């Protein structure tokens, strides 16, 4: 119901916009296609409906591939939780007892 | 003769094309030789470990 | 079950043909999982992690040279 | 008009290679000096120019 | 006007799509080398 | 490629030094015409 009607707006924006009322809508179809291919900007297609917002997650964004990643091999009773900090490791290691205290206080 | 927001999104694309290209350049500066040295070292340190083990 | 439920659906804006093919292109099926790459900013995020992981491999090879300097002496 | 065609698509190739040369100058300046030794492309340009 | 920027940003996309795919293949190799 | 015989020699000295039931005397590094004799002096035992 959402996705079905988003897809109809996207298909309309990429082939048959009706925003401008003459030959300029055929140039607007190319503008909507270009924006969708770059994965940015806005598919304007009718004066009565919001534009098709384009991100790099949109199907027509050409800047996509698949790559590879290792899965984790540690188990839930290993207790291993990762925290990433806005800190350099020499600050983390020198604060490490104060960080253990602070995490213990965050554990009540 | 267009809605003004379509000019603003032409200006937004004239920012975004540069943000992709500047990162395509940041990638086009990267070098594998540090990762090739890791394979250079893995041969040398295996041979030096075998000289140790055999001795 | 977690792996198979994840692989059952193409990620946001990946084409199904590319998502199914990337499960055949995967060289180790129980250590490794297919994960998308989207825009040059994800490629740069990988390359910066490859730079820092290269250094973290080097910092262990540096110590393996010290571990072998124990042995030969 | 055909003698214009072949001059135009020649000049299009000429101009596209000079954009590709000036991208080496644009990249060498954005490369930090601690990595500028890894970027062979200025010496590739001078070897090709010779 | 606009269509000249469109036809240029086609030629700067049929530029960058190649660099993206080559840099993606390069990253897929270097991820496997570090594994 | 540039990975010479020293890799394989280091594995050859091991195949000797893990069969050498240790003497009180070292062994002699035979010249190539003693090596050619030792091979045939041994093959002439084996083929009996």
Swiss-Prot record, chain C:
<comment type="subunit">
    <text>Component of the p62 complex, a complex composed of NUP62, NUP54, and the isoform p58 and isoform p45 of NUP58. Interacts with NUTF2.</text>
</comment>
<comment type="similarity">
    <text>Belongs to the NUP54 family.</text>
</comment>
<comment type="function">
    <text>Component of the nuclear pore complex, a complex required for the trafficking across the nuclear membrane.</text>
</comment>
<protein>
    <recommendedName>
        <fullName>Nucleoporin p54</fullName>
    </recommendedName>
</protein>
Curated annotation (Swiss-Prot), chain D:
<comment type="subunit">
    <text>Component of the p62 complex, a complex at least composed of NUP62, NUP54, and NUP58. Interacts with NUTF2. Interacts with SRP1-alpha and Importin p97 proteins when they are together, but not with SRP1-alpha protein alone.</text>
</comment>
<protein>
    <recommendedName>
        <fullName>Nucleoporin p58/p45</fullName>
    </recommendedName>
</protein>
<comment type="function">
    <text>Component of the nuclear pore complex, a complex required for the trafficking across the nuclear membrane.</text>
</comment>
<comment type="similarity">
    <text>Belongs to the NUP58 family.</text>
</comment>
<feature type="modified residue" description="Phosphothreonine">
    <location>
        <position position="31"/>
    </location>
</feature>
Curated annotation (Swiss-Prot), chain E:
<comment type="subunit">
    <text>(Microbial infection) Interacts with Epstein-barr virus BGLF4; this interaction allows BGLF4 nuclear entry.</text>
</comment>
<comment type="subunit">
    <text>Component of the p62 complex, a complex at least composed of NUP62, NUP54, and NUP58. Interacts with NUP88. Interacts with NUTF2. Interacts with HIKESHI. Interacts with OSBPL8. Interacts with CAPG. Interacts with SAS6 and TUBG1 at the centrosome. Interacts with MCM3AP isoform GANP.</text>
</comment>
<comment type="function">
    <text>Essential component of the nuclear pore complex. The N-terminal is probably involved in nucleocytoplasmic transport. The C-terminal is involved in protein-protein interaction probably via coiled-coil formation, promotes its association with centrosomes and may function in anchorage of p62 to the pore complex. Plays a role in mitotic cell cycle progression by regulating centrosome segregation, centriole maturation and spindle orientation. It might be involved in protein recruitment to the centrosome after nuclear breakdown.</text>
</comment>
<protein>
    <recommendedName>
        <fullName>Nuclear pore glycoprotein p62</fullName>
    </recommendedName>
</protein>
<comment type="similarity">
    <text>Belongs to the nucleoporin NSP1/NUP62 family.</text>
</comment>
UniProtKB/Swiss-Prot annotation, chain F:
<comment type="subunit">
    <text>Part of the nuclear pore complex (NPC). Component of the p62 complex, a complex composed of NUP62 and NUP54. Forms a complex with NUP35, NUP155, NUP205 and lamin B; the interaction with NUP35 is direct. Does not interact with TPR. Interacts with SMAD4 and IPO7; translocates SMAD4 to the nucleus through the NPC upon BMP7 stimulation resulting in activation of SMAD4 signaling.</text>
</comment>
<comment type="subunit">
    <text>(Microbial infection) Interacts with SARS-CoV translation inhibitor nsp1; this interaction may disrupt nuclear pore function.</text>
</comment>
<feature type="modified residue" description="Phosphothreonine">
    <location>
        <position position="48"/>
    </location>
</feature>
<comment type="similarity">
    <text>Belongs to the nucleoporin interacting component (NIC) family.</text>
</comment>
<protein>
    <recommendedName>
        <fullName>Nuclear pore complex protein Nup93</fullName>
    </recommendedName>
</protein>
<comment type="function">
    <text>Plays a role in the nuclear pore complex (NPC) assembly and/or maintenance. May anchor nucleoporins, but not NUP153 and TPR, to the NPC. During renal development, regulates podocyte migration and proliferation through SMAD4 signaling.</text>
</comment>
